[PDB]
């Protein structure tokens, strides 16, 4: 929420569709992390259908730039809202106002050359408060192609590796949801006929948590247990 704004933050945040602006005013009935329910006022309720609004918030999902899109409710239970009020603030939005960065206590002074030409000097309090910490969601695809000399299987039986390396996989060769895989870990076990190891693995230097796994199967291929 920029301390020194220009007043255009709310217009930019609302007009761009990232928040959950209430379609019809009313009273908030239910608020969880991923859903908001609004009981519309009798004055704004059409004759006939009753007649309440359900806003399904889009939780952690990947943007085009591998950032995080995550709408958070900004209203409490039993709180009146009117037409055109934000109910959930998306990414880089605070109570319906555009909020890109964070406002921090700055001092203009040379400091032993650590801000020599154009550099910044940052305290450990900024990194402890986790205020410039960002979430980056990455999508990695493993495809089994109908190649010559035999097709590709997504089994967990992989040579040249031990059982400690395959312990993070399930019985179907796909990593569990929530496993803290790091660089070099095997996400999706896949082998190609000659057999050789061609499994999808995390790129080196990349850590993180597997948050969602999607399996797409062509028609008539007898999807495995995990699918």
């Amino acid at each position: 929420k920029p301390l020194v704004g220009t007043g255009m933050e709310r217009a930019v945040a609302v007009d761009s569709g990232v928040t959950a602006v209430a379609k019809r005013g009313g009273v908030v009935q239910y608020v969880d992390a991923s859903r908001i329910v609004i009981k519309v006022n009798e004055d704004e309720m059409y004759p006939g259908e009753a007649g309440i609004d359900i806003y399904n918030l889009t939780k952690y999902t990947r943007s085009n730039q591998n950032t995080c899109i995550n709408q958070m409710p900004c209203v409490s239970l039993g709180e009146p809202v009117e037409r055109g009020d934000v109910l959930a603030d998306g990414p880089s939005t605070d109570l319906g106002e555009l909020a890109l960065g964070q406002n921090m206590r700055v001092a203009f002074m040379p400091w032993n050359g650590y801000n020599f030409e154009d550099s910044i000097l940052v305290s450990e309090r900024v990194v402890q408060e986790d205020r410039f910490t960002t979430i980056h969601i990455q999508e990695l695809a493993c495809v089994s192609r109908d190649t010559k000399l035999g097709p590709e299987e997504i089994t967990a039986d992989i040579p040249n590796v031990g059982e400690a390396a395959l312990s993070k996989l399930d019985e179907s060769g796909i990593v569990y949801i929530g496993a803290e895989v790091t660089g070099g870990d095997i996400l999706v076990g896949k082998v190609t006929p000659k057999v050789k190891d061609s499994s999808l693995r995390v790129p080196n230097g990349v850590s993180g948590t597997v948050i969602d796994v999607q399996v797409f199967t062509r028609d008539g291929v007898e999807k495995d247990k995990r699918a």
């Binding site: 969880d32 992390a33 939780k59 952690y60 995550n70 409490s76 239970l77 949801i177 496993a179």
Partner: protein, 218 residues
């Protein structure tokens, strides 16, 4: 010779922040001791921060739980901000079980009589509907400094460790017109703790650290 300073007063203003006094001091020793103690206190003080959490129906911190409006990541942030004092142990596992509409604060944690929560009003999350219940296990452990999860079951959520009770330390050197002698200094140390460290104990530990570091060449 050099008069020896001693802890003459501890003015505890509020629960969080306190104001200690050292008197007397010779010329220049006020600033020397003030800055040395301020750096020691801001650097090395034992704390009892949270390290691991385990919510039952939650696999990873980037998910949501039905009936709780906070995201699991926001719950982990609120737990990271939790101030707690453990006395007889180094690590301890607090248990939180709460159901029904309302704010789940820190007062709902199982007492664990050797472990004291110093801010019972600290809201951890919110439960929206009556048929919702949360049950989590919070690993509060003793440490020093700031240890992120990058340095150190698929259902265990690791939080960044911030075992530093003090939040703000300031010192002021004033003139202590006492003992029928002028040009003597008095050091007033205003410290802002989270409530889990007694100011006299903080000053004592800070002086002990300096005394131990000075043993390299004396």
């Amino acid at each position: 010779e050099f008069l020896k300073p001693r802890l003459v007063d501890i003015e505890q203003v509020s629960s969080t922040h306190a104001k200690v006094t050292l008197e007397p001091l010779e010329r220049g020793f006020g600033h020397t001791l003030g800055n040395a103690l301020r750096r020691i206190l801001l650097s090395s003080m034992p704390g009892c921060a949270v390290t691991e959490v385990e919510i039952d129906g939650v696999l990873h911190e980037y998910s949501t739980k039905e009936g709780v409006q906070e995201d699991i990541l926001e719950i982990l942030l609120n737990l990271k901000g939790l101030a707690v004092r453990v006395q007889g142990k180094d690590e301890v596992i607090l248990t939180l079980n709460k159901s029904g509409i309302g704010p789940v604060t820190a007062a709902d944690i199982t007492h664990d009589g050797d472990v004291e929560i110093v801010k019972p009003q600290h809201v951890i999350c919110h439960l929206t509907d009556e048929n919702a219940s949360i049950s989590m296990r919070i690993k509060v452990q003793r440490g020093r400094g700031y240890v992120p999860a990058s340095t150190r079951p698929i259902g265990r959520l690791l939080v960044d460790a911030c075992y530093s009770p003090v939040e703000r330390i300031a010192y002021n050197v004033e003139a202590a017109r006492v003992e029928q002698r002028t040009d003597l200094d008095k050091l007033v140390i205003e410290m802002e703790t989270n409530g889990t460290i007694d100011p006299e104990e903080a000053i004592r530990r800070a002086a002990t650290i300096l005394a131990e570091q000075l043993e390299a060449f004396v």
